[PDB]
Amino acid sequence: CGKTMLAKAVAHHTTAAFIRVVGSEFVQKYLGEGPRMVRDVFRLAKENAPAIIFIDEIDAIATKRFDAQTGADREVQRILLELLNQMDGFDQNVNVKVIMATNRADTLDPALLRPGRLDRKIEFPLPDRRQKRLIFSTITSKMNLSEEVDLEDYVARPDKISGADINSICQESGMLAVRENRYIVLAKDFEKAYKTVIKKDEQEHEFYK
Amino acid sequence: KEIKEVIELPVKHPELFEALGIAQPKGVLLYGPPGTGKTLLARAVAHHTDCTFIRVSGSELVQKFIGEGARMVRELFVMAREHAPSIIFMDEIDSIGSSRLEGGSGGDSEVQRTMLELLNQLDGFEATKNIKVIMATNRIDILDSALLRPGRIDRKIEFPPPNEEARLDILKIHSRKMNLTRGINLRKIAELMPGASGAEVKGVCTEAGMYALRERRVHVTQEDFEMAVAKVMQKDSEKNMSIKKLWK
Amino acid sequence: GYSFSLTTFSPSGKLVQIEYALAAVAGGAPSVGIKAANGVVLATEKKQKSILYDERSVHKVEPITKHIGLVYSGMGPDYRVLVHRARKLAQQYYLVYQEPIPTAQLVQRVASVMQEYTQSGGVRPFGVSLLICGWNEGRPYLFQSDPSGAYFAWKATAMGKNYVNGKTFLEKRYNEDLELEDAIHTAILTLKESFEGQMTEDNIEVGICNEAGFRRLTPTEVKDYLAAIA
Amino acid sequence: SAGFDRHITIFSPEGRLYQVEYAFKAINQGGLTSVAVRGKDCAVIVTQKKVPDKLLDSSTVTHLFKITENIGCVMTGMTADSRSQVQRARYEAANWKYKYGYEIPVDMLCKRIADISQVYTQNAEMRPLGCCMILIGIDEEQGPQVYKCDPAGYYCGFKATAAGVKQTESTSFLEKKVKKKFDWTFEQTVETAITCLSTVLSIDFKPSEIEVGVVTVENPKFRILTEAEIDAHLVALAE
Amino acid sequence: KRFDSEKAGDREVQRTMLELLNQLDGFQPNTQVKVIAATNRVDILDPALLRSGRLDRKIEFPMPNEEARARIM
Amino acid sequence: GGDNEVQRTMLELINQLDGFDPRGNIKVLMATNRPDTLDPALMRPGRL
Amino acid sequence: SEQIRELREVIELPLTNPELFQRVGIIPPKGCLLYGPPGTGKTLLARAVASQLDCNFLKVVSSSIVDKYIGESARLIREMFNYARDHQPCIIFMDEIDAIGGRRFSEGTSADREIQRTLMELLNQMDGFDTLHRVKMIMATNRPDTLDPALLRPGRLDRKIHIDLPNEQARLDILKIHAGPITKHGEIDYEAIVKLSDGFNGADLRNVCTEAGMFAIRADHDFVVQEDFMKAVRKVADSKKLESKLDYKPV
Amino acid sequence: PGRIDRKIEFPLPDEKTKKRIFQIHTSRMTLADDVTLDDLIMAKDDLSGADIKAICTEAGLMALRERRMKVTNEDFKKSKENVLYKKQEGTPEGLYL
Amino acid sequence: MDDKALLVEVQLLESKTYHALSNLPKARAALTSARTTANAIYCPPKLQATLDMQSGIIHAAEEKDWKTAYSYFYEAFEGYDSIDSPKAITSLKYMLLCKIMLNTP
Amino acid sequence: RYDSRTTIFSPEGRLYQVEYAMEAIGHAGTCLGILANDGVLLAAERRNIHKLLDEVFFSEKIYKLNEDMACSVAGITSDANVLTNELRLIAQRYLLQYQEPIPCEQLVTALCDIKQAYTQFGGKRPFGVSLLYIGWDKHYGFQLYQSDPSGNYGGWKATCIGNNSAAAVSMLKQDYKEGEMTLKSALALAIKVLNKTMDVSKLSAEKVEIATLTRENGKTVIRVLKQKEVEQLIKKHEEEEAKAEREK
Ligand SMILES: Nc1ncnc2c1ncn2[C@@H]1O[C@H](COP(=O)(O)OP(=O)(O)OP(=O)(O)O)[C@@H](O)[C@H]1O
Ligand SMILES: [Mg+2]
Ligand SMILES: [Mg+2]
Structure with missing residues (x-):
């Protein structure tokens, strides 16, 4: 739904020190390296300018919800404890900002969700009407279409499309004219590129409906 | 006032415990649900202690190599003998200090290897003096029953969610620099929180003043708060109800 | 995880395999059912994977007696078992009492059938939830069973995929008093919320309850009903 | 991810179950493909044979199986599970005539087959028969029909039918094939039933490598084609 | 399997390993300085590091079947 | 990684136990409490 | 013959003609996925793309960049572009895209995103989105159990193609290549080899012509008689049948 | 044996030697004559020797908390509560009888 | 009170007259309160396009957003498709005006 | 561990499956x-x-x-x-x-x-259901009984359910009556106990249920009393709160 693009759009028109970190390279082996990489970010951040710390995904480790009576799950659990200690531990105030992005947010820790730590909650819908028009306009604005084939016949369609797959449609019809040696889209291929990417039903075995 | 009895009183007046004839306490545990003032009380003491304050977060005692991930804890507390009155603080012992599990390729040895040194530099062959520890975390039943013994920690202090009389006083502190107009009742707004955390009273105070920012306004009405109550307070929203009625 | 099985508890909560059986219910085809003032309307979603599948072969709205119908959201192969169970069970009331069985009485007994496969262990529970309708003694009824064995009495509900969008639709939609003809109008309008692209006379399949008995609609009316009525 | 239910038949956390859907890839060790086509008042089965030995016979190879005098079928999947599936089909077709006094419909028989395959999924402790079955038959006031039964207990009747290894390639050909409104006059049926299998497998077979079962409104008896007239339809499409 | 570190350790063994790899590709395969190697476990060795013109011929030694036991005894 | 340097000493013990240049008159006695967890390279007769 | 050219102009036309990528405007065509057997296909038809210009090649082992913290790996991206900047479209040959030391299973033990920490950053930062001068990448591997569902967008694996192992007639093509610089009489019925051959692997039919020379070392054949190839099939193809672990499929 | 020849159990105390624990830890404190040591011993039968030192220090803090030097029974009533509330509620319900 | 659909009328009609008296930010706040009120009604089968026109009006009064306000005018015309013709014919006047002002004539 | 079927004791008498239910x-x-x-x-x-x-x-x-x-x-x-x-x-x-x-x-x-x-026989489950009993007989009159999953039971005079409302048992003893046990004296006690335990304030009538059993002319009628007279029972207790604050 256009999540990381919004983080990239902030990095242009800011005067900050933008720091993006994937939430996967600290869930690794070598017990103790995980929580120290959290310290390596913030000591690099708080020594520097007003900065933005964009953690890409924590749909991975973000949830306690049980006491781990096992091995190597308390190491999973304690990275959150290190994350909480240098988020809303001491004051640590001056000009540090943290942005996170996930899937469904009911899974994760309620200790994260108190305000003062994660004050803002923003939900993303998909491509509803009047927003399919705006994304079709802007992508085809910087694209020589040059036909009398109206695109709004695909605005008014059902089969709701994620915002990344709109980008796939206009680029596929770009391939589906140039590969056939056309210096302009003729938009008889635009039907076929639409029907191509919409077929993600796969198999489902015609079973359990 | 209980923290004055264990930290201020032995440092300021040690001769009282001489005349009364008891040993002096040194162990403090702070517990409760999240967002109930556990870390201000560390910083409020540290602003007024007139003493050495040693901050240790509870997760850097593992490093990466065995044996040196432990011994600096022994080098930590022996450095506190240099500044002979001192207060050492623990951040969030839901890490190291949890439980002695089994052997095998499960649990962890090295977490226990560090924990046994914490278990012993304050209760070993040599008893220390003028060094006091404060530990603060939730999850009371899952830290180990060898540092919870009252030879180690003498004061266990809860932090319940505040009362309606107490939610009013928290609301007055953060709305102090906030500028309210007139005709506004904080007690009505304090009754709109059926069991708030107390830390989320700030989230009401920030989001109510945020409504005036998008209006290019400095005036804050009571309507700004009542919209901010429904924004901050949420629910789990347990859907499909089949889980509920399997479990009636 | 503890689970792995059905004949033991977890140390903290409840039976986990029954909760996993409800996950197959949510991954099924969507469905809707609305109880109006004079009847109950059932409507479901039915799309083939290809243009080759004959749509008039296997049906979704399935009558039990001449005044009782039934739909589902789950797996169709498990659905055909308890339908054939509910047919023969409904005749056993009629051989004893010589009277058509009330709709509150099957749901006592059909849920006790789905009860029995949650026992033993060497067996699996169903992966099907149901919706049962009927107009007995003037007032119509609309119930819902589950693989755990409980049951309900709904005004309006929706199962299958994207049921939370249909529920917040119907929470904003369903009033107390409408006729059956207005009830089908808001029953297709909630099927259009989560359906796929084309919606023809063969993509949906709708049955109703009058006081004149149970009836499922032929596609001649359903084409004429979906013809520009929203 | 899997783990949880990949040995026995129980549920997976939120998803489905794997032992039944491992039987769907248990057809593909046969190394075979079958095609059924219903266009108009007739019905055609076509399936190739694969004879890897000269000492191996010819008559004991055919997968076309006569269930009743008006109902024939074809079997895919592994061989030994296929024939025991046919023994139940021959058995319960005769119980209908005994209990009820008339010829069983082709629609009613796949209900009785898939319900037996249903219990083996619901109740455990029997391997669920990794084979697939396709039926044809003539019904009064309904025309000819083509049905498919699945190892999961699913069934659905449909016009153009593929099975075996190459469903997704043959059905992709037949979707583009059955979209124009051409009539199907009993040789339009067969020639499309040949050339679909002939291009998807890419064999354009020699005459002695297949089988063709047929049924037609005129003579409703199930009929296996003679090798001579198989050559007659093969020289018909390539004029 | 070579692994990265920060305290030397193995960070001379690859300089001994690659010198074996550089010399073996250093000369053309003209049979006169044929090289024989033998290990007990294959799963330690670097398979993509041999594979073409390095140590290449696989001579496995299976266990004696029946009569090969009776021969050795 | 792990017990790398221990393996180099342990495999050097093996090649001066059997291999080229057999030792002759050198008798080796070993004793353990946990014999299950030993290397099959030492379990071969000719070495033990 | 179908795959010499299907891969050719899907690489040639975007690099030769970037001006059509402003006549409609998209920079994105970043190469095919060559998946199938090991065979000879991964190494030999990469040299078939080398037929016009091409050259570059270099090598991608798919292992020296896959180090865990990707602050080094992003420098290891641009370290290889220190020579790819020295030219026109350089053609980064990339071997074993999906292969780690050992095997790769699903997300259990170390069979994890160690590729995809690097891999999703490559198609971001190597070429396409972050690019320099229409350099072309050619993905080629045969193992891959775990993959990106976002890899199937136009711009990472724009079109995919599968390599098959048998033909029974491209045997005879590859056979006469390997029955080339070996001394004989011209006595050979090469199709009599092929009908008696059951190898089903192009790299292993290379082994068949090797062992027929070993039968020529036997019995002092400075030539190679037609029997030596029939001797070679019975030795080589029987040795292929006596190996386990026969489950491999690229996704 | 050969390495360690003695294995020594240290069990939790009794109702007899527990008197000696309370006697020694109340050596040099001003003890009012209202108290009975056997009140807290006999009524509750579970608690360690390190518990008893915490009770004696807490009851001394209660005297300064309400402006006293001597220590009465009401100090030990509040101290025996406050020390022991760190160990959970119970095990099983009345199955056994 | 408890009735809801009359609130959406009086919130939108005030957002007309605050804009008619040339008060821009107060008409913004009255429109925003009309949006969050209009999220809980069975159907605004015609009032949606009435709401979506003046979403475009106040957004055009910024003289800053000449693309999304065009989308609000166009959605208002689609709601006015042959079921309210006098309000439909004025919808072309605003959406062509927004396309002139976007310098794409 | 010992979290298998219910037909196996733990090392010491602690049937874990019965305790889980x-x-x-x-x-x-x-x-x-x-x-x-x-x-x-x-x-x-x-x-x-x-x-x-x-x-x-x-x-x-x-x-x-x-x-x-x-x-x-x-x-x-x-x-x-x-x-x-x-x-x-x-x-x-x-x-x-x-x-x-x-x-x-x-x-x-x-x-x-x-x-x-079901606790001794097979690998299944005990009943996870506790339930109450009300009734009248010839021998003892009005009675109360309390079922358990283990098959244990017991007579009572006032009882309730646990971790949801275990604090009500403390209220039943603190506001206990004996002898003065008329129905109207007990219905006023019932709406007061459900007021605190049900944490939703003001006690809407659609969240509760009251069923009685009397003895009338030798018939023993059983009343599930309707929602109209729940209303005047709740507002009586709401009036008693405004009367109780006169001491303040
Ligand atoms: N009683 C209170 N008065 C004023 N502010 C409070 C109060 N309680 C909490 N806060 C606010 O909560 C924040 C501090 O969090 P706190 O000290 O409760 O740590 P904590 O939330 O207990 O730690 P954790 O997040 O690990 O639970 C500060 O913003 C502080 O202003
Ligand atoms: Mg993203
Ligand atoms: Mg804190």
Whole structure:
């Protein structure tokens, strides 16, 4: 739904020190390296300018919800404890900002969700009407279409499309004219590129409906 | 006032415990649900202690190599003998200090290897003096029953969610620099929180003043708060109800 | 995880395999059912994977007696078992009492059938939830069973995929008093919320309850009903 | 991810179950493909044979199986599970005539087959028969029909039918094939039933490598084609 | 399997390993300085590091079947 | 990684136990409490 | 013959003609996925793309960049572009895209995103989105159990193609290549080899012509008689049948 | 044996030697004559020797908390509560009888 | 009170007259309160396009957003498709005006 | 561990599967019966009172069972319908045999022997259902009984359910009456106890349920009293709060 693009759009028109970190390279082996990489970010951040710390995904480790009576799950659990200690531990105030992005947010820790730590909650819908028009306009604005084939016949369609797959449609019809040696889209291929990417039903075995 | 009895009183007046004839306490545990003032009380003491304050977060005692991930804890507390009155603080012992599990390729040895040194530099062959520890975390039943013994920690202090009389006083502190107009009742707004955390009273105070920012306004009405109550307070929203009625 | 099985508890909560059986219910085809003032309307979603599948072969709205119908959201192969169970069970009331069985009485007994496969262990529970309708003694009824064995009495509900969008639709939609003809109008309008692209006379399949008995609609009316009525 | 239910038949956390859907890839060790086509008042089965030995016979190879005098079928999947599936089909077709006094419909028989395959999924402790079955038959006031039964207990009747290894390639050909409104006059049926299998497998077979079962409104008896007239339809499409 | 570190350790063994790899590709395969190697476990060795013109011929030694036991005894 | 340097000493013990240049008159006695967890390279007769 | 050219102009036309990528405007065509057997296909038809210009090649082992913290790996991206900047479209040959030391299973033990920490950053930062001068990448591997569902967008694996192992007639093509610089009489019925051959692997039919020379070392054949190839099939193809672990499929 | 020849159990105390624990830890404190040591011993039968030192220090803090030097029974009533509330509620319900 | 659909009328009609008296930010706040009120009604089968026109009006009064306000005018015309013709014919006047002002004539 | 089937003791007498079922009922509904001379009552709680249900039965927690007895229920609903159809079928077997109603104790022990028998036999489950008993007999009059998953039981004069409402038992002792046990004195006690335990304030009538049983002319009528007279019972207690603050 256009999540990381919004983080990239902030990095242009800011005067900050933008720091993006994937939430996967600290869930690794070598017990103790995980929580120290959290310290390596913030000591690099708080020594520097007003900065933005964009953690890409924590749909991975973000949830306690049980006491781990096992091995190597308390190491999973304690990275959150290190994350909480240098988020809303001491004051640590001056000009540090943290942005996170996930899937469904009911899974994760309620200790994260108190305000003062994660004050803002923003939900993303998909491509509803009047927003399919705006994304079709802007992508085809910087694209020589040059036909009398109206695109709004695909605005008014059902089969709701994620915002990344709109980008796939206009680029596929770009391939589906140039590969056939056309210096302009003729938009008889635009039907076929639409029907191509919409077929993600796969198999489902015609079973359990 | 209980923290004055264990930290201020032995440092300021040690001769009282001489005349009364008891040993002096040194162990403090702070517990409760999240967002109930556990870390201000560390910083409020540290602003007024007139003493050495040693901050240790509870997760850097593992490093990466065995044996040196432990011994600096022994080098930590022996450095506190240099500044002979001192207060050492623990951040969030839901890490190291949890439980002695089994052997095998499960649990962890090295977490226990560090924990046994914490278990012993304050209760070993040599008893220390003028060094006091404060530990603060939730999850009371899952830290180990060898540092919870009252030879180690003498004061266990809860932090319940505040009362309606107490939610009013928290609301007055953060709305102090906030500028309210007139005709506004904080007690009505304090009754709109059926069991708030107390830390989320700030989230009401920030989001109510945020409504005036998008209006290019400095005036804050009571309507700004009542919209901010429904924004901050949420629910789990347990859907499909089949889980509920399997479990009636 | 503890689970792995059905004949033991977890140390903290409840039976986990029954909760996993409800996950197959949510991954099924969507469905809707609305109880109006004079009847109950059932409507479901039915799309083939290809243009080759004959749509008039296997049906979704399935009558039990001449005044009782039934739909589902789950797996169709498990659905055909308890339908054939509910047919023969409904005749056993009629051989004893010589009277058509009330709709509150099957749901006592059909849920006790789905009860029995949650026992033993060497067996699996169903992966099907149901919706049962009927107009007995003037007032119509609309119930819902589950693989755990409980049951309900709904005004309006929706199962299958994207049921939370249909529920917040119907929470904003369903009033107390409408006729059956207005009830089908808001029953297709909630099927259009989560359906796929084309919606023809063969993509949906709708049955109703009058006081004149149970009836499922032929596609001649359903084409004429979906013809520009929203 | 899997783990949880990949040995026995129980549920997976939120998803489905794997032992039944491992039987769907248990057809593909046969190394075979079958095609059924219903266009108009007739019905055609076509399936190739694969004879890897000269000492191996010819008559004991055919997968076309006569269930009743008006109902024939074809079997895919592994061989030994296929024939025991046919023994139940021959058995319960005769119980209908005994209990009820008339010829069983082709629609009613796949209900009785898939319900037996249903219990083996619901109740455990029997391997669920990794084979697939396709039926044809003539019904009064309904025309000819083509049905498919699945190892999961699913069934659905449909016009153009593929099975075996190459469903997704043959059905992709037949979707583009059955979209124009051409009539199907009993040789339009067969020639499309040949050339679909002939291009998807890419064999354009020699005459002695297949089988063709047929049924037609005129003579409703199930009929296996003679090798001579198989050559007659093969020289018909390539004029 | 070579692994990265920060305290030397193995960070001379690859300089001994690659010198074996550089010399073996250093000369053309003209049979006169044929090289024989033998290990007990294959799963330690670097398979993509041999594979073409390095140590290449696989001579496995299976266990004696029946009569090969009776021969050795 | 792990017990790398221990393996180099342990495999050097093996090649001066059997291999080229057999030792002759050198008798080796070993004793353990946990014999299950030993290397099959030492379990071969000719070495033990 | 179908795959010499299907891969050719899907690489040639975007690099030769970037001006059509402003006549409609998209920079994105970043190469095919060559998946199938090991065979000879991964190494030999990469040299078939080398037929016009091409050259570059270099090598991608798919292992020296896959180090865990990707602050080094992003420098290891641009370290290889220190020579790819020295030219026109350089053609980064990339071997074993999906292969780690050992095997790769699903997300259990170390069979994890160690590729995809690097891999999703490559198609971001190597070429396409972050690019320099229409350099072309050619993905080629045969193992891959775990993959990106976002890899199937136009711009990472724009079109995919599968390599098959048998033909029974491209045997005879590859056979006469390997029955080339070996001394004989011209006595050979090469199709009599092929009908008696059951190898089903192009790299292993290379082994068949090797062992027929070993039968020529036997019995002092400075030539190679037609029997030596029939001797070679019975030795080589029987040795292929006596190996386990026969489950491999690229996704 | 050969390495360690003695294995020594240290069990939790009794109702007899527990008197000696309370006697020694109340050596040099001003003890009012209202108290009975056997009140807290006999009524509750579970608690360690390190518990008893915490009770004696807490009851001394209660005297300064309400402006006293001597220590009465009401100090030990509040101290025996406050020390022991760190160990959970119970095990099983009345199955056994 | 408890009735809801009359609130959406009086919130939108005030957002007309605050804009008619040339008060821009107060008409913004009255429109925003009309949006969050209009999220809980069975159907605004015609009032949606009435709401979506003046979403475009106040957004055009910024003289800053000449693309999304065009989308609000166009959605208002689609709601006015042959079921309210006098309000439909004025919808072309605003959406062509927004396309002139976007310098794409 | 020892979390296998229920046919295996732990190292020391601690049947873990029985203990897991006896803790499961705390996360369920809330039921209580009170003392009464010349009567008895039950009180229950309406869970998940969402506005798209019918309640066609108008009796969900309460099941009238023979003629002069009813029962509450708390636990797994799948096992709840099995027991009630079994328990009604016990009382008619006794009535066919002696032509006299079942005397309210050996009905309970007949179920408790069934509920026990699933703890010794096979790899299945115990019943995860505890439930109450109200009734009248010739020998002792009005009675109360308390079922358990283990098959243990016991008579009571006032009782409730655990981890949901275990604090109500402290209130029942603090506001205990003995002798002055009329029905109106007990209904006022019932709405006060459900006020604190049900944490939703002001106690809407659609969240509760009250069922009584009296003795009138030798008939023993059973009342599930309607929602109209719940209203004037709640507002009576709401009036008593405004009267109780006169001491303040
Ligand atoms: N009683 C209070 N008065 C004023 N502010 C409070 C109060 N309680 C909490 N806060 C606010 O909560 C924040 C501090 O969090 P706190 O000290 O509760 O740590 P904590 O939330 O207990 O730690 P954790 O997040 O690990 O639970 C500060 O913003 C502080 O202003
Ligand atoms: Mg993203
Ligand atoms: Mg804190």
